[PDB]
């Protein structure tokens, strides 16, 4: 389990019918090139292995901050980065610093289901669904 | 007196994205930032309290929770900030902010750290 096709991300939103927050851990410049609509920039600047997720809060703009302790209100938070798969999340690796901060570690907020890891991530999600990303 | 010269000094600085504030800076960002205040020829009197007003554990109530910000929100384009040479951050001085109340600023100001949209008037 721990994972998401695009297919299956993009039914679940365009059937509005199940809450989702859609977490992009590419760099900070990555994202505002080019990100998922809707989703949260947890950037990997502001990600590294061990950390908390009220380390991660810390670091994150107002507007961010408000989705991410939010995060225990929704039934699914995905996660994503350029290339990515749940084979992938090995120690060190962005997407498992940010599963462990969000599923592991010490946090205030429980997640609802464990976080799922879009597969192909980003790369596979601009060619497949390119109108469902913030540049046309 | 040797405040208000180097508030005059300071560019008028234009707030774009209120909500990219970044309210819980850490230690090395508060660090950077005192740098860039003292290099600016921050007087030593008021230099370490403004840096002390970065982060919002030393805000006024006006500012001092994320739920206060987002519904204030409209209200800090009011404010009379200056540019901190370099950065995306502001200082709200005191001395210019009257109209604002003290639940807004306090002496001798504060500093508003951004991740982007900080721009010149």
């Known amino acids: ?136 | 007196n040797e405040i208000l010269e180097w508030v005059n000094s300071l560019q008028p600085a234009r707030v774009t994205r209120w909500g990219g504030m970044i309210s819980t800076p850490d230690a090395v960002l508060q660090a950077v930032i005192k740098r860039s205040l003292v290099e600016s020829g921050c007087p030593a009197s008021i230099v370490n309290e403004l840096i002390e007003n970065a982060h919002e554990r030393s805000w006024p109530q006006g500012l001092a929770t994320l739920e206060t910000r987002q519904m204030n929100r409209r209200y800090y384009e009011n404010y009379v900030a200056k540019r901190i040479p370099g950065k995306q951050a502001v200082v709200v001085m005191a001395c210019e902010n009257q109209h604002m109340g003290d639940d807004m600023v306090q002496e001798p100001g504060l500093v508003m750290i951004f991740a982007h949209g900080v721009e010149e008037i």
Request: proline share 4%; hydrophobic share 40%.
């Open chain 1, 1 to 136: 389990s721990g994972a998401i096709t695009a297919k299956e991300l993009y039914t679940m939103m365009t059937d509005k019918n199940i809450s989702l927050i859609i977490m992009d851990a590419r760099r900070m410049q990555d994202y505002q090139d080019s990100c998922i609509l809707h989703s949260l920039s947890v950037p990997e600047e502001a990600i590294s292995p061990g950390v908390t997720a009220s380390w991660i809060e810390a670091h994150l703009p107002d507007d961010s901050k408000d989705t991410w302790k939010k995060r225990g209100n929704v039934e699914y938070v995905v996660l994503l980065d350029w290339f990515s798969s749940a084979k992938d999340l090995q120690i060190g690796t962005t997407l498992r610093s940010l599963k462990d901060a969000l599923f592991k570690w010490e946090s205030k907020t429980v997640l609802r289901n464990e976080p799922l890891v879009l597969e192909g991530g980003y790369e596979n999600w601009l060619l497949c669904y390119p109108q469902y990303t913030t540049n046309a």
